[PDB]
């Protein structure tokens, strides 16, 4: 695994070197301490914003990547087993370059969708929707390996830190932006296309009225599918195994229970 | 107090030994550090999930229970007095076995109400509705002793950690489940029956439009009473000294201002 | 700067001495550790509640004020420059007495608007709306100096701790109260008068439906202006560059898109 880490850290470092200036800084930002997965991934993906400049080298990216790998491996092993952990973490490592590319697009979307943002640096440093998506994109790779415990725990850390509630099972394309974010809920089987803009208190999920009865069916597709270029306004509750088309605008406090066709505004 | 602690820890230990296998694990889970009351109560009620297996003995349950008792006593004394603190903490100790039984039913309700849950172990480890209810059930015993300060502070820790806002005065029966949970508000005089299922952004509370005037009447019954087998959908705002009957289903974003009779679906 | 700190700490100390008894306590409260800006400002503005009584002297207020000044200066410098930082922190220091006076009125409003509050001491110690406003009032002085980065980071700390989302650019008058608070969003160009009472899940903000296109106009007045004696009920979404008059009552889950005239109740 250490040799694969070296190769992945090398690729991520070369990407860092080739990133546009907006993804770089010569500033030494105030040191913060957040939960482990975010702390580590912040340094790995955007070292200029979370490390002293005198320290960014490839070797240091590799060093942080190793600390992260060892931590996730340990946690996956606790809930599962040693072999399953190795395979899942190799899968995360495999996807880190593509995630890095996607996270860049999420930043572009954040700046493009928010008149309050002065530059990418502030989004990177402290935008809660962005902190959540960083961790989500890794948690999802775990889910894709069949893991069902630690990937949820990781997202519950995100949940506590940002009040954004994204199940690791959700599938989310790039140029993704959650603004403000408190009360956002995105379910296990939610599917979200490119250029989705989501506001505070938005649910892309499900409700289960008590059938007593007692014990609800496990899993199955039961959360919305959302197309490209969708904007979901504050307080909107989109519920059930329903399809929202592309280029859809959803108004504030809307209660959506059925399919919504492409190229529409709902209020 | 130490002799009463020993007796209570003995009872809790015997209950632990007699718990069904779903409430047990041989796994050594990743060590977490959360606010004191939750950290301690997690170990006391579900040691398999928060202690190394080589350490669970009765003596260790007693040890953790002592640390918790000393901490709560100290905090209650700060806001009140030494004698009042002793009585309140003796009352908590008294209720710990019954709370343990109730918390088991809350877990059953959580698993039964959530298709995303793979087993009780994940709910125990990281479900925010469950973390909140653990602390709430103890905070409520303080409120029942007449304490009005520290029990609120304790629940504000829960508030920061999970964004679930349950006043220690609320009365809540068993098989209780808050799914997702961000934005849940449950007021001081709210009464909730058995098998209540509550989603994100649900208020069981009150609003006070300014009478200027100036200073609103203190206390009194002013929050909803809810029966058994009630499901309250995402964003529902249930306000005032009103009665919701049993077997009631409440739809998303609903604004409920008046009594709702038993065996009904509202949207 | 140290001589100006001494003078400001002297004034704040004299104000402390002249505060009514409700703003004082002989109790030694349980020690808490929260994010730096709140930790420091809590001690500076309300030392009786966050320091051991044997330690409150003027010299100790000055000591804490220095620690805060050094921290904010360091963070402002990181995002901007040394000279800009000095000017901004001198501006904060300048405003601290007036902020102290305003924070007293916010407490009065909190107690007056909440039947659950037993005394100012509990609001001071743990009410999340109040913790947020303490930090907001300082963050706003930074914004007023033209700072756009660290003042946002500071409020994102508030955001994580309380789930209350107040842009440092918002202008808010005194006797301000957010009850419960989770999901409150108050935008960069929001203007709020005296005696505003706000509940959980209230947005005073804006939504931006995707014009693709791509990159939205930066800034400009785009969030609501709210008059005096306004109460905004749970879940209300007040959006756009609109004017809400004085003595307005807004009902639960309301979706407000246009001007609302003075002396009105909306549902």
PDB file of C-alpha atoms in Angstrom, chain A residues 16-178:
ATOM      1  CA  UNK A  16      -1.273  20.798  -7.586  1.00  0.00           C
ATOM      2  CA  UNK A  17       1.677  22.205  -9.590  1.00  0.00           C
ATOM      3  CA  UNK A  18      -0.531  22.543 -12.696  1.00  0.00           C
ATOM      4  CA  UNK A  19      -3.558  24.060 -10.930  1.00  0.00           C
ATOM      5  CA  UNK A  20      -4.617  27.552 -11.996  1.00  0.00           C
ATOM      6  CA  UNK A  21      -3.551  30.405  -9.651  1.00  0.00           C
ATOM      7  CA  UNK A  22      -7.019  30.671  -8.054  1.00  0.00           C
ATOM      8  CA  UNK A  23      -6.334  27.271  -6.450  1.00  0.00           C
ATOM      9  CA  UNK A  24      -3.045  28.534  -5.016  1.00  0.00           C
ATOM     10  CA  UNK A  25      -1.879  30.937  -2.306  1.00  0.00           C
ATOM     11  CA  UNK A  26       1.412  32.228  -0.862  1.00  0.00           C
ATOM     12  CA  UNK A  27      -0.402  33.138   2.366  1.00  0.00           C
ATOM     13  CA  UNK A  28       0.108  31.256   5.607  1.00  0.00           C
ATOM     14  CA  UNK A  29      -3.406  30.859   6.950  1.00  0.00           C
ATOM     15  CA  UNK A  30      -4.410  30.507  10.644  1.00  0.00           C
ATOM     16  CA  UNK A  31      -4.053  26.918  11.863  1.00  0.00           C
ATOM     17  CA  UNK A  32      -7.340  25.132  12.478  1.00  0.00           C
ATOM     18  CA  UNK A  33      -8.105  21.745  14.046  1.00  0.00           C
ATOM     19  CA  UNK A  34     -11.168  19.876  12.775  1.00  0.00           C
ATOM     20  CA  UNK A  35     -12.187  16.188  12.740  1.00  0.00           C
ATOM     21  CA  UNK A  36      -9.526  13.871  11.354  1.00  0.00           C
ATOM     22  CA  UNK A  37     -10.897  13.032   7.887  1.00  0.00           C
ATOM     23  CA  UNK A  38     -11.518  16.699   7.005  1.00  0.00           C
ATOM     24  CA  UNK A  39      -8.229  17.871   8.599  1.00  0.00           C
ATOM     25  CA  UNK A  40      -6.254  15.402   6.470  1.00  0.00           C
ATOM     26  CA  UNK A  41      -8.191  15.779   3.207  1.00  0.00           C
ATOM     27  CA  UNK A  42      -7.958  19.590   3.430  1.00  0.00           C
ATOM     28  CA  UNK A  43      -4.126  19.311   3.495  1.00  0.00           C
ATOM     29  CA  UNK A  44      -4.006  16.679   0.739  1.00  0.00           C
ATOM     30  CA  UNK A  45      -6.280  18.454  -1.762  1.00  0.00           C
ATOM     31  CA  UNK A  46      -5.505  22.112  -0.958  1.00  0.00           C
ATOM     32  CA  UNK A  47      -2.131  22.277   0.867  1.00  0.00           C
ATOM     33  CA  UNK A  48      -1.609  26.035   0.198  1.00  0.00           C
ATOM     34  CA  UNK A  49      -4.536  26.806   2.460  1.00  0.00           C
ATOM     35  CA  UNK A  50      -3.854  24.382   5.291  1.00  0.00           C
ATOM     36  CA  UNK A  51      -0.043  24.069   5.389  1.00  0.00           C
ATOM     37  CA  UNK A  52       2.845  26.501   5.907  1.00  0.00           C
ATOM     38  CA  UNK A  53       4.258  27.176   2.399  1.00  0.00           C
ATOM     39  CA  UNK A  54       7.756  26.108   3.500  1.00  0.00           C
ATOM     40  CA  UNK A  55       6.335  22.575   3.947  1.00  0.00           C
ATOM     41  CA  UNK A  56       4.564  21.648   0.638  1.00  0.00           C
ATOM     42  CA  UNK A  57       6.840  19.177  -1.238  1.00  0.00           C
ATOM     43  CA  UNK A  58       5.179  15.890  -2.463  1.00  0.00           C
ATOM     44  CA  UNK A  59       6.860  14.116   0.463  1.00  0.00           C
ATOM     45  CA  UNK A  60       4.583  16.077   2.796  1.00  0.00           C
ATOM     46  CA  UNK A  61       1.473  15.298   0.687  1.00  0.00           C
ATOM     47  CA  UNK A  62       2.515  11.621   0.840  1.00  0.00           C
ATOM     48  CA  UNK A  63       3.030  11.956   4.615  1.00  0.00           C
ATOM     49  CA  UNK A  64      -0.500  13.326   5.159  1.00  0.00           C
ATOM     50  CA  UNK A  65      -1.990  10.804   2.739  1.00  0.00           C
ATOM     51  CA  UNK A  66      -0.347   7.993   4.761  1.00  0.00           C
ATOM     52  CA  UNK A  67      -1.791   9.349   8.025  1.00  0.00           C
ATOM     53  CA  UNK A  68      -5.255   9.449   6.426  1.00  0.00           C
ATOM     54  CA  UNK A  69      -4.900   5.975   4.884  1.00  0.00           C
ATOM     55  CA  UNK A  70      -3.760   4.476   8.194  1.00  0.00           C
ATOM     56  CA  UNK A  71      -6.686   6.111  10.041  1.00  0.00           C
ATOM     57  CA  UNK A  72      -9.397   5.015   7.561  1.00  0.00           C
ATOM     58  CA  UNK A  73      -7.921   1.516   7.297  1.00  0.00           C
ATOM     59  CA  UNK A  74      -8.005   1.218  11.108  1.00  0.00           C
ATOM     60  CA  UNK A  75     -11.629   2.382  11.307  1.00  0.00           C
ATOM     61  CA  UNK A  76     -12.833   0.226   8.398  1.00  0.00           C
ATOM     62  CA  UNK A  77     -11.096  -2.800   9.983  1.00  0.00           C
ATOM     63  CA  UNK A  78     -12.845  -2.162  13.337  1.00  0.00           C
ATOM     64  CA  UNK A  79     -16.299  -2.336  11.720  1.00  0.00           C
ATOM     65  CA  UNK A  80     -15.453  -4.980   9.125  1.00  0.00           C
ATOM     66  CA  UNK A  81     -12.183  -6.878   8.624  1.00  0.00           C
ATOM     67  CA  UNK A  82      -8.519  -6.365   7.663  1.00  0.00           C
ATOM     68  CA  UNK A  83      -8.840  -7.608   4.060  1.00  0.00           C
ATOM     69  CA  UNK A  84     -12.034  -5.639   3.336  1.00  0.00           C
ATOM     70  CA  UNK A  85     -10.342  -2.512   4.759  1.00  0.00           C
ATOM     71  CA  UNK A  86      -7.280  -2.923   2.496  1.00  0.00           C
ATOM     72  CA  UNK A  87      -9.479  -3.221  -0.625  1.00  0.00           C
ATOM     73  CA  UNK A  88     -11.659  -0.252   0.319  1.00  0.00           C
ATOM     74  CA  UNK A  89      -8.688   2.010   1.034  1.00  0.00           C
ATOM     75  CA  UNK A  90      -6.975   0.970  -2.194  1.00  0.00           C
ATOM     76  CA  UNK A  91     -10.240   2.042  -3.904  1.00  0.00           C
ATOM     77  CA  UNK A  92     -10.171   5.436  -2.160  1.00  0.00           C
ATOM     78  CA  UNK A  93      -6.522   5.943  -3.160  1.00  0.00           C
ATOM     79  CA  UNK A  94      -7.396   4.988  -6.767  1.00  0.00           C
ATOM     80  CA  UNK A  95     -10.132   7.655  -6.929  1.00  0.00           C
ATOM     81  CA  UNK A  96      -8.261  10.540  -5.228  1.00  0.00           C
ATOM     82  CA  UNK A  97      -7.054  12.200  -8.452  1.00  0.00           C
ATOM     83  CA  UNK A  98     -10.562  12.127  -9.995  1.00  0.00           C
ATOM     84  CA  UNK A  99     -12.076  13.437  -6.745  1.00  0.00           C
ATOM     85  CA  UNK A 100      -9.503  16.278  -6.769  1.00  0.00           C
ATOM     86  CA  UNK A 101     -10.677  17.244 -10.286  1.00  0.00           C
ATOM     87  CA  UNK A 102     -14.320  17.071  -9.193  1.00  0.00           C
ATOM     88  CA  UNK A 103     -13.667  19.159  -6.067  1.00  0.00           C
ATOM     89  CA  UNK A 104     -12.202  21.883  -8.291  1.00  0.00           C
ATOM     90  CA  UNK A 105     -15.491  21.990 -10.244  1.00  0.00           C
ATOM     91  CA  UNK A 106     -17.470  22.155  -6.970  1.00  0.00           C
ATOM     92  CA  UNK A 107     -15.408  25.231  -6.039  1.00  0.00           C
ATOM     93  CA  UNK A 108     -16.079  26.843  -9.421  1.00  0.00           C
ATOM     94  CA  UNK A 109     -19.799  26.188  -8.847  1.00  0.00           C
ATOM     95  CA  UNK A 110     -19.624  27.648  -5.323  1.00  0.00           C
ATOM     96  CA  UNK A 111     -18.002  30.883  -6.464  1.00  0.00           C
ATOM     97  CA  UNK A 112     -20.280  31.129  -9.526  1.00  0.00           C
ATOM     98  CA  UNK A 113     -23.417  30.624  -7.402  1.00  0.00           C
ATOM     99  CA  UNK A 114     -22.614  32.942  -4.464  1.00  0.00           C
ATOM    100  CA  UNK A 115     -22.403  36.769  -4.714  1.00  0.00           C
ATOM    101  CA  UNK A 116     -20.982  36.742  -1.158  1.00  0.00           C
ATOM    102  CA  UNK A 117     -17.811  34.809  -2.117  1.00  0.00           C
ATOM    103  CA  UNK A 118     -14.708  37.041  -2.594  1.00  0.00           C
ATOM    104  CA  UNK A 119     -12.487  34.245  -4.043  1.00  0.00           C
ATOM    105  CA  UNK A 120     -11.931  30.475  -3.998  1.00  0.00           C
ATOM    106  CA  UNK A 121      -9.596  30.799  -1.004  1.00  0.00           C
ATOM    107  CA  UNK A 122     -12.500  31.612   1.394  1.00  0.00           C
ATOM    108  CA  UNK A 123     -14.649  28.767   0.066  1.00  0.00           C
ATOM    109  CA  UNK A 124     -11.737  26.375   0.523  1.00  0.00           C
ATOM    110  CA  UNK A 125     -10.973  27.684   4.002  1.00  0.00           C
ATOM    111  CA  UNK A 126     -14.422  27.781   5.582  1.00  0.00           C
ATOM    112  CA  UNK A 127     -17.495  27.227   3.361  1.00  0.00           C
ATOM    113  CA  UNK A 128     -19.459  24.452   5.120  1.00  0.00           C
ATOM    114  CA  UNK A 129     -21.078  23.034   1.951  1.00  0.00           C
ATOM    115  CA  UNK A 130     -17.536  22.592   0.611  1.00  0.00           C
ATOM    116  CA  UNK A 131     -16.142  20.963   3.777  1.00  0.00           C
ATOM    117  CA  UNK A 132     -19.038  18.503   3.611  1.00  0.00           C
ATOM    118  CA  UNK A 133     -18.517  17.656  -0.069  1.00  0.00           C
ATOM    119  CA  UNK A 134     -14.770  17.010   0.479  1.00  0.00           C
ATOM    120  CA  UNK A 135     -15.560  14.332   3.032  1.00  0.00           C
ATOM    121  CA  UNK A 136     -18.643  13.081   1.142  1.00  0.00           C
ATOM    122  CA  UNK A 137     -16.653  12.341  -2.011  1.00  0.00           C
ATOM    123  CA  UNK A 138     -14.341  10.047  -0.058  1.00  0.00           C
ATOM    124  CA  UNK A 139     -17.137   8.494   2.072  1.00  0.00           C
ATOM    125  CA  UNK A 140     -18.963   7.608  -1.166  1.00  0.00           C
ATOM    126  CA  UNK A 141     -15.973   5.542  -2.424  1.00  0.00           C
ATOM    127  CA  UNK A 142     -16.225   3.498   0.788  1.00  0.00           C
ATOM    128  CA  UNK A 143     -19.949   3.018   0.168  1.00  0.00           C
ATOM    129  CA  UNK A 144     -19.181   1.959  -3.408  1.00  0.00           C
ATOM    130  CA  UNK A 145     -16.873  -0.781  -1.996  1.00  0.00           C
ATOM    131  CA  UNK A 146     -19.846  -2.162  -0.054  1.00  0.00           C
ATOM    132  CA  UNK A 147     -18.933  -0.629   3.319  1.00  0.00           C
ATOM    133  CA  UNK A 148     -21.935   0.412   5.411  1.00  0.00           C
ATOM    134  CA  UNK A 149     -20.672   1.456   8.853  1.00  0.00           C
ATOM    135  CA  UNK A 150     -17.577   3.660   8.965  1.00  0.00           C
ATOM    136  CA  UNK A 151     -18.619   5.685   5.858  1.00  0.00           C
ATOM    137  CA  UNK A 152     -21.777   6.624   7.773  1.00  0.00           C
ATOM    138  CA  UNK A 153     -19.737   7.526  10.898  1.00  0.00           C
ATOM    139  CA  UNK A 154     -17.505   9.768   8.794  1.00  0.00           C
ATOM    140  CA  UNK A 155     -20.545  11.600   7.416  1.00  0.00           C
ATOM    141  CA  UNK A 156     -21.961  11.979  10.945  1.00  0.00           C
ATOM    142  CA  UNK A 157     -18.784  13.958  11.728  1.00  0.00           C
ATOM    143  CA  UNK A 158     -19.711  16.187   8.768  1.00  0.00           C
ATOM    144  CA  UNK A 159     -23.291  16.239  10.118  1.00  0.00           C
ATOM    145  CA  UNK A 160     -22.121  17.579  13.532  1.00  0.00           C
ATOM    146  CA  UNK A 161     -19.698  20.116  12.047  1.00  0.00           C
ATOM    147  CA  UNK A 162     -21.927  21.677   9.325  1.00  0.00           C
ATOM    148  CA  UNK A 163     -25.470  20.363  10.039  1.00  0.00           C
ATOM    149  CA  UNK A 164     -25.429  19.020   6.454  1.00  0.00           C
ATOM    150  CA  UNK A 165     -26.692  15.436   6.317  1.00  0.00           C
ATOM    151  CA  UNK A 166     -25.503  13.530   3.258  1.00  0.00           C
ATOM    152  CA  UNK A 167     -25.737   9.751   3.322  1.00  0.00           C
ATOM    153  CA  UNK A 168     -22.501   8.204   1.975  1.00  0.00           C
ATOM    154  CA  UNK A 169     -24.684   6.234  -0.504  1.00  0.00           C
ATOM    155  CA  UNK A 170     -25.861   9.362  -2.341  1.00  0.00           C
ATOM    156  CA  UNK A 171     -24.451   9.765  -5.849  1.00  0.00           C
ATOM    157  CA  UNK A 172     -23.515  13.352  -6.701  1.00  0.00           C
ATOM    158  CA  UNK A 173     -21.944  14.678  -9.904  1.00  0.00           C
ATOM    159  CA  UNK A 174     -19.600  17.689 -10.188  1.00  0.00           C
ATOM    160  CA  UNK A 175     -20.078  21.457 -10.050  1.00  0.00           C
ATOM    161  CA  UNK A 176     -22.047  20.804  -6.873  1.00  0.00           C
ATOM    162  CA  UNK A 177     -22.886  23.602  -4.429  1.00  0.00           C
ATOM    163  CA  UNK A 178     -24.719  23.678  -1.112  1.00  0.00           C
TER     164      UNK A 178
END
